[PDB]
Ligand binder design. Structure first.
Ligand SMILES: [Mg+2]
Ligand SMILES: [Mg+2]
Ligand SMILES: [Mg+2]
Ligand SMILES: [Mg+2]
Lengths: 328, 328, 328, 328
C-alpha cells in the first residue's frame, strides 16, 4: 500500500555518519551500521558510555567534532537529556553546515516545537519498534524488523531517498516493512500506548488483587499465581505476534472465549471515551508541557508514585514469593 | 467625569527621557516625542532595531547608559522579553537614582508582582489603545487618540502631574480623553478582550463552516465568501466606531435586526457565565502563571495550535481562494 | 473547482432588462448595467425613489409597464415589501409572457415557497456579497467582486447561460469568482451569519462591560475604549480579508495568540451545539414563519428590543463619549 | 415623593375635548368632565353606544368630525378594537392638526409600537385604577380616586401641565394621588396582575376542590361553601384596603396567622421564579404578539378554555348551589 519492501543504499556511502549516543539504541544501531560497510564516527559525552563507545573500536570524537566532520547525524539519545545538548553543542555548529541532514528516532521533541532547526538543513525521522535490546537478537538472526519514517523539512528533495537509504543501512529492511508517515502520528502512537492500555491493565490487576484479598478471604499467594506470577501472559503475547490477536484464542477453552468476547463488547464505549480524552490531551500538547515542567521541578511525583507502588501490599507479597522461587 | 481633556507639559522639559525599545510602540512614541520638542535618548539592544533606532537620527545609548543619563524612562518593549532585562541591566542601576520615574505601557508584569521596584522611585502607567501602527496615521492626521493611566507608587506626589504631562507629550491629548484608573483594571480589560469575544467569534465562524460543508453539501467557496472572505465585517466595525454599536444596525435590513436582537437576548446568560469564569481566572493570577510556564517550557502548545489552525480545511480553502484573488 | 472565472454576454443584448427597485441594490446594479452597454428600463413605485430613478436619466416605467415591455426582470427590492407587489402587479402579467426570465438577489422568498411562479418561466438566482454601498466603490476601482448563483426552474435550458451572462453584465466578473449553488444554500448562509456569530459577539461584549463596571469598579470609559470604541476591530477585519484569518494573528503579540487559541479550542463544542440548533430551525422553515407573523402583527418585539438596546447603560455612555469625540 | 396632591386646570378651558368611546370608561369620564364645566364632544360609532352617547345630551359627532373640531382627544375604547380605528379614521386626520394632544388610558398599544403617531403631536398617558363602574360611585361620594400618568412625546413642553390639568378635570384629584411614571411601567403592572396572582389563586382553589372531593370523600357542597361560596374573601379584601394587608390579619385567629405566615415564607422562592419568568416574557414583547395573533386567528383558545371552565365539575356544582340560594 504505502509501504516499501526494499530500497537503495545510494547516497549514504561517500559521506560520514554522525551517531550521537551510544546507549540502548545508539550502540546497537551503530554496530549494525559498521556491519553494513560504513564509516563510524560517534560523538558522545566522555562518560562511562565513552568507554562503551571505544570498547567496540569506534572513532569517538566529541559531539562538536563529530558533527563538524559529519555530513549527517543521528540523535539516538533520550528525549529528556535533549534540549540542552542541542542548544549548547549543536545549534551553533548548524549555521556553518548547509547540506546537512538531521534524523531522529522520535518526533516528540520536534513535533511539539521543542526544537526548530534552521531552514538550511533537512529534517526527517526513522523509528525502530521494540525494546532496543530486543532488536539485537532479531538482527543476530538476520530477519527484517520494521520501522516508520517521516519528513518535516525538505530543502534538497533527496529527503525520502535519504530516509530509505538509512532504513536499509540499519537493516530494518529487507525482511520488514517501512511505512511513510509524519512525526505527529509516531509520537501520538507511542504515547497512546504508554497511556491507555498499559496502565489500565496494571490498575485492573491491582484492583482484582485488592478485591479478592479484602472481601473474599484469599491469600495473596493464589491471587499472584493466577494474575501475573505465572508466565501465561507471555505465551499469550507470543501467540498474538504469530497467528493473530483473535485467532490465537482458538488455543484456549470455549468458556474463556465466551466470557472474554462478551465482556469486551460490553465495555468498549467506556475505554473509547477514555482514549478519546487522552488522545485529545496529547494532540493539543498539554502532556509535553506537564512533563517538561515535572522535569524542571525535581521529579517529585515520579518519586512519590514509585514509592507507593513499591510500598504497596502486592509488591511485598511479590517480593516474598519471587524470593521463594529464587527469581531476582 | 473622571476624565481630563488637556493638561500641562510642566515638569517634562528640563529632564532627560529614557525610551527602552524602538519597535511597534517605542519607535513611534519616540517619533512623536521628538516632534513635541524633547530630548531623545533611546536605550536598545544593538540588534536590527539599533539600525532602526539610529535610522531616525536619535541618541542610541545602551540601556544602562540611557537610564544612567535619564531622569525618567519608558519600557515599551513587550511583556515576555522583560523580567530578564529588568534584572540584568536595570534593577542594579536603580539603587543609585532616587528621584527616578518609571512608566509602563501595560500593568501585566507589575500587577502580578513579576516586578517590584524599590520604594525610592515612582511607579505609574500610561496606555495607548490600538495596534501601534494604527496610531501612526491617526497622529499624522493630528486628531486626539485616547489613553489610560494609573499610579502604583507615589513617593514624591508629582506622580499624577508626571502622568498627565507625559500623556500630553505623546499627543494622545488634546483631542482625546485620559482616564484615571489602576493597573489591575487595564490588564483585566486587555485580557478579557483577548480571551472572551475574539476566540468565541473565531470558533463560531469555524463551526458554521464545518457544519455547512459537512451536513448540507455546500462548497467551501460560498461559506468563505459569506462568513469572512467578504469585507462586510470591516464596514460594520467602522460604522460602530462612528455612530454607535446599535444605531449602526439601522443601515441593515430589518430581518437581520430582528434575528440578531432575538438571538442576542436569548444567549446572554451563557456567555455571561463564561466571562465570569475567565475574569475570575485572571483576577486571581492563574493565567500569568500558566503563560510564564509555557514560556519556560518551550512554547509547545503555541506551536501545535498554530499548526492545527494553519493545517485545517478552512485555511487551505482560504489559501486557494485568496490566491485566486491575488491577495497575499 | 465548481467556479467560473469569466463567461459570455451572449443572449442579454437583443432583449430588454427589467429592474424592479432603485434602492441600495437596484440603483447601483442598474448604474453598472447601463455602463455595460445595455437598455435601461426601471419599474418602480412613483415615490421618492422615482425621483432617484429618473435623477440618473433612466426609462422609469411603472412596474406593469416595465415587465410588459421587458423580456427579463430583476427583483432587487427587499424581502418584506414583496409578496404584495408580486401578487398585485406581477402574478397577473406572467400568464401572457412565456419566454420570460425571473432572477432574484436572495432565495428567501422562494426557498420557503412564499413565491411559486408558473412553469412557463425560468427561475434563477444571483447574489452580491456585501453592504450594497460597498460594491459601488469596489467597482469604481474596477476590480472583480464575487457572487453566487443557482437555478430553480429551467424550461428552456439557457438558464445557466442566462445566469452567467447576467453575472458578467453586472461586472462581478471578471476579477471575481462565481459559484454554482442552490437557493437553500444561499439563504441558509445569510441567516446563519445573521444569527450565530454577530449576536453572540454583541452579547459577549455587553456582558464584559456589565461584569467589569458592576463587579470590579471600572468606569464605563475604559471599558468602551477597550472593547469597541477603538478602531482595533476594523484593522483586524481588514487584515483578515487580505492575509487570512489566522496568519493575520502573526501581527499581534504572542500572549494574545496563546490565550486566543486556547480559549477557542476550549469552547468549540458549545457554539457548535448552538449553531446546529439554529441551522436546523432554519432548514425546517420555522424562522420564516416567525418573521412573517411578526410582520403581520405590527413589529412589536422589534420595537421593544430596539428600545432596550438604545436605553441600556452602555448605549448612554457611548452617546456621551462619541459626543465628546464629535462622532455623530 | 414623586406625587402631586392637586394641580391647575389651566389650559383645558378654551379648547375642545375629544372623547373617543362612550362605554365603561368613556361615558363615565365624560360625565365627570361635563360636570367639571367643560365642552362635551364625543366621537363614537353610530351603534347602540350612540343612543347611549346622546341619551345624556352630548354632542355626538362622528369620529373624524370630533377630532377635526377637537384640539385634544381621548381613546377610552378597548385595546383590541383599536389599530383599525386609528389607521382608518385617525392617522389621516393627524397630518393637518399640529398642536394636537393625544392621551390614552393604557400604554399597551403604544408601549409595544403598535401605534406610532407623528412627531407633530404630544403623546401622554393617564390611567384610572379600578373596574370602571367602581369609579362611578366613588365619585358620587366625591372622594379622590388615584391615577397614574406618563409622557412619551413632548414637542411643546406643556405636556406635564396638560396631564395634570386633565387629571384634575376628571376629578381623580383632589383627594387622591397622581404618580409620574412611563407607559412601560403601567402596562407591565396591569399584566403582572392579570398573569401572576389571579390565575394562581384560581388554580389553587380548583386544585383544593379536586383533591378534597377525589381523595377524602367530601361533597362539593362543603368544599364550595368553604373556599369561595362564602363572602369571606370580600371582607378580607375590604379590610386590606382600609387597615393594611398584614395588620388586617389581627382580626383573625392566631392559628390562621401562624399557618399563613409560615407557609408564605416557605414558598416565596417558587412564585418568585414564576413572576420573573412572566415579567421577562412581557418586558420583551412576546405576549403582545401572542395575543394579536390569537385575535387574527379567530379566538379559538379563548373559546376552548371558556368551555372547559364552564363545563368542569366545580362549575356545575356551583350552578346547582347558587340556584339553591337564588343567586343569579
Ligand atoms: Mg517510547
Ligand atoms: Mg494587548
Ligand atoms: Mg442579508
Ligand atoms: Mg386591565
Amino acid at each position: 500500500d504505502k509501504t516499501v519492501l526494499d530500497a537503495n543504499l545510494d547516497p549514504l556511502k561517500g559521506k560520514t555518519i554522525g551517531v550521537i549516543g551510544y546507549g540502548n539504541q545508539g550502540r546497537v544501531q551503530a554496530t549494525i551500521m559498521r556491519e553494513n560497510g560504513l564509516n563510524v564516527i560517534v560523538g558522545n559525552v566522555k562518560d562511562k558510555y565513552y568507554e562503551l563507545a571505544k570498547k567496540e573500536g569506534f572513532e569517538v570524537y566529541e559531539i562538536d567534532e563529530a558533527v563538524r566532520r559529519s555530513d549527517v547525524a543521528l540523535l539516538l539519545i533520550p528525549d529528556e537529556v535533549m534540549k540542552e545538548v542541542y542548544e549548547k553543542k549543536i545549534a551553533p555548529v548548524l549555521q556553518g553546515k548547509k547540506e546537512f541532514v538531521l534524523d531522529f528516532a522520535s518526533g516528540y521533541n520536534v513535533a511539539f516545537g521543542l526544537i526548530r532547526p534552521p531552514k538550511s538543513v533537512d529534517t526527517i525521522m526513522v523509528a525502530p519498534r521494540m525494546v532496543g535490546e530486543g532488536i539485537m537478537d532479531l538482527h543476530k538472526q538476520g530477519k527484517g524488523y520494521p520501522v516508520l519514517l517521516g519528513v518535516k523539512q525538505d530543502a534538497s528533495g533527496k529527503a525520502w531517498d535519504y530516509a530509505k537509504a538509512i532504513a536499509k543501512g540499519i537493516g530494518a529492511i529487507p525482511g520488514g516493512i517501512a511505512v511513510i508517515s509524519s512525526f505527529e502520528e509516531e509520537a501520538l502512537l507511542d504515547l497512546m500506548s504508554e497511556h491507555t492500555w498499559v496502565p489500565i491493565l496494571f490498575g485492573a490487576i491491582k484492583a482484582c488483587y485488592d478485591i479478592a484479598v479484602k472481601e473474599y478471604g484469599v491469600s495473596p499467594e493464589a491471587a499472584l499465581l493466577e494474575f501475573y506470577a505465572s508466565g501465561e501472559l507471555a505465551e499469550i503475547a507470543r501467540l498474538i505476534a504469530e497467528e493473530g490477536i483473535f485467532n490465537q484464542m482458538v488455543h484456549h477453552s470455549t468458556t474463556s472465549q465466551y466470557g472474554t468476547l462478551t465482556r469486551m463488547f460490553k465495555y468498549y464505549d467506556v475505554v473509547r471515551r477514555i482514549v478519546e480524552n487522552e488522545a485529545k490531551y496529547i494532540w493539543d500538547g498539554s502532556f509535553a508541557k506537564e512533563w517538561s515542567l515535572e522535569q524542571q521541578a525535581g521529579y517529585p511525583v515520579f518519586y512519590r508514585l514509585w514509592e507507593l507502588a513499591t510500598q504497596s501490599e502486592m509488591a511485598k507479597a511479590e517480593k516474598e514469593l519471587y524470593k521463594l522461587l529464587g527469581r531476582k
